[PDB]
């Protein structure tokens, strides 16, 4: 054909069918899915729907607060960076033999959010007892409508795929207790959550509210000066996020000793190194809080490393990795006609005006 840049591979136009994706035992073929999605292939829409809703029925049966054994690989934000998610699985271990816990923010910002969701939901269907997914602040209607996810679904699939995702996101658990030692959440603590029972009591099956404990678990952050406070305030309103709170070092230590925990493992803030360890608890000598962030070269500009945490009896191995190549997309998943046509219109008309004048 007359295709100019031959070296560039061409996405497949064939859309994967139900028999290609699911074998006759009901198990997704994740290898086949991985290869197709890496090529910017699509599923038939009914097949994407089946993955989304079958994942959601597994999520719906899980508790608000998950009980997760060591060893486990704990991952922070992904934000639609599907090609880095492929590398993450190499760094962290095969889901076939590694327990995983993801801490939310699978979608928005990166242009491959639906591929991340289809892949992780497929993995959840295949490994229901060893792969765990928490809710992040982006996994809701309000943010995906303002950021890119709703538009991504409209252009790649349809709004039914979007609506099914929104129902699936409502079923995501809010928190995990890992190795009976760590509380894992996307954002952090609430002035209304003093015990683990306070998490178990929540009704999670809804759009996150604008305030309250569910909001706080997904949205709160440590103080900028966490550990080095001169504000004896445990929870101060989070003016950067516009909701929820900043929590202080004494707030965290209070929660930890009250509940006999070692640390809070959370995500939600980008880190140059892919992780950050905060001030040690004096009772234990271990960081009171750790942020993990798993999106390398975030937004294609931060130039950060990503990391995951591989926790195993008596050792926290933090494993860093760098970004991988990914395909180009115009803003808002615009096609080249929509992008260029107004300019074409004005430039032809302008030519003729100058010729006729």
């Amino acid at each position: 054909t007359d295709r100019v840049v031959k070296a560039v591979p061409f996405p497949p136009s064939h859309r994967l069918t139900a028999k290609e994706v699911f074998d006759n035992d009901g198990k997704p073929r994740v290898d086949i899915l991985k290869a197709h999605l890496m090529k910017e292939g699509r599923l038939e829409e009914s097949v994407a729907l089946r993955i989304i809703t079958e994942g959601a029925s597994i999520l719906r049966q899980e508790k608000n607060l998950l009980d997760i054994d060591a060893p486990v690989t704990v991952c922070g934000d992904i934000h639609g960076q599907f090609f880095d998610l492929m590398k993450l699985f190499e760094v962290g271990g095969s889901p076939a033999n590694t327990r995983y816990l993801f801490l939310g923010d699978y979608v928005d910002r990166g242009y491959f959010s639906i591929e991340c969701v289809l892949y992780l939901w497929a993995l959840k269907i295949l490994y229901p007892k060893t792969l765990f997914l928490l809710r992040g602040n982006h996994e809701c209607r309000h943010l995906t409508e303002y950021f890119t996810f709703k538009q991504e679904c409209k252009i790649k699939y349809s709004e039914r795929v979007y609506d099914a995702c929104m129902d699936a996101f409502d079923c995501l658990p809010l928190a995990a207790l890992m190795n009976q030692q760590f509380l894992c959440v996307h954002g952090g603590l609430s002035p209304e959550i003093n015990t683990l029972d306070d998490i178990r009591k929540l009704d999670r099956f809804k759009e996150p509210p604008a305030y309250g404990p569910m909001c706080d678990i997904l949205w709160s952050d440590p103080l900028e000066d966490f550990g080095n406070e001169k504000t004896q305030e445990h929870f101060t309103h989070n003016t950067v996020r516009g909701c929820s709170y900043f929590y202080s070092y004494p707030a965290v230590c209070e929660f930890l000793q009250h509940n006999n925990l070692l640390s809070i493992l959370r995500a939600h803030e980008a880190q140059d190194a892919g992780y950050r360890m905060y001030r040690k608890s004096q009772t234990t000598g271990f960081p009171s809080l750790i942020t993990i962030f798993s999106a390398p070269n975030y937004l294609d500009v931060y130039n950060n490393k990503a990391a995951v945490l591989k926790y195993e009896n008596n050792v926290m191995n933090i494993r860093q990795f760098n970004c991988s190549p990914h395909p180009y997309w115009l803003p808002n998943f615009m096609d080249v006609f929509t992008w260029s046509l107004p300019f074409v219109g004005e430039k032809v008309t302008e030519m003729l005006v100058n010729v006729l004048n």
Binding site: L262, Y275, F286, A307, N317, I318, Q320, F321
Partner: peptide
């Protein structure tokens, strides 16, 4: 019993 942290790159 203070657990150890080991940080390595993969890349």
């Amino acid at each position: 019993e203070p657990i150890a942290i080991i940080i390595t790159d993969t890349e």
